[PDB]
């Protein structure tokens, strides 16, 4: 009950320096390149809005050109637990007098809607849902970028957390990207998941 579809427009590239084991997909038309550590804006039918990921691994087949694109899932502002955030970042968090809608509003109207949150949850991606390359950066770089931010592709990450939007832990996204494209998939994914346990 399976069929083989051709990944139109894409082409696999094998290297170390170049050559005909390291891998990364390249798109013929514009030539964009996707490999471990790159972040991408993807179409998410169920959610009715985009989701951003960081390519974790490119599982390829030695026999045929079958590719599987796997990646770490980011959370966008609206997937953060509003009460958890307030309790962990607000100065006088002991007082939670107000109705849930109030915290929803507070967070939504003061959050950087382009600040993502890393998570260790992997998801397989389908190329036809690929929208554009995402620029995920550190707060320092994000500061220099203000006034020239392209909300369609520019994002900043300072924490990693649980898929539920709790337990925020500091990270240097650049160090994470560097790390991810260094070690082996399972290793990186295991470590990334133990930072919030």
């Amino acid at each position: 009950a399976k069929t083989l579809k051709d990944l139109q427009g894409w082409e696999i590239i094998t290297t170390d320096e170049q050559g005909n084991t390291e891998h990364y997909l390249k798109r013929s038309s514009d030539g964009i390149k996707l490999g471990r550590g790159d972040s991408v804006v993807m179409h998410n039918e169920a959610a009715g809005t985009y989701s951003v990921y960081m390519i974790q691994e490119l599982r390829l087949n030695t026999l045929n050109n079958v590719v599987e694109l796997w990646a770490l899932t980011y959370l966008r502002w609206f997937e953060v637990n509003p009460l958890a955030h307030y309790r962990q970042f607000n100065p006088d968090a002991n007082i939670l007098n107000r109705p849930l809608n109030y915290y929803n509003k507070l967070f939504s109207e003061t959050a950087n809607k382009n600040e993502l949150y890393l998570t260790a949850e992997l998801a397989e991606l389908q190329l036809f849902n690929f929208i554009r390359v995402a620029n995920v950066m550190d707060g320092s770089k994000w500061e220099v970028l203000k006034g020239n931010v392209d909300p369609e592709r520019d994002f900043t990450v300072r924490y990693i957390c649980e898929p539920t939007g709790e337990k925020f832990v500091d990270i240097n996204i650049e160090d994470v990207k560097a790390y991810i494209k260094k070690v082996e998939p399972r290793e990186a994914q295991e470590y990334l998941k133990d930072l919030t346990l």
């Binding site: 169920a46 809005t49 966008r76 609206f78 509003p82 809608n101 929803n104 939504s108």
Partner: protein
Amino acid sequence: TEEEYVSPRFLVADGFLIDLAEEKPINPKDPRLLTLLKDHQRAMIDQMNLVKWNDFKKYQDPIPLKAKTLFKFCKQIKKKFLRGADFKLHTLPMTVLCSCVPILLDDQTVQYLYDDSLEH
């Protein structure tokens, strides 16, 4: 009409359910909401007054709205309309480049909402 955050993503203001993740209005009948929202949230929307997007099919010209909140959070685009003598904006075929919000109906015809607190 009253405003309120049904969730961090969904905001109800000026008669529309606003999807902040997409920066646009969403039909309160979109099946996705059945899964995207919890019952208490969908109940909040029931108890509120929401424009029935089907009532829109019947109109050919863009609709002028008095809704400071909607235009504050929704993406807008430039569209060209005719400036009639009734001081309203009309479909093209006295031209004005006006920014407005597009909403996709079931009729598949796109309806345009522009800020009525603006003089062109």
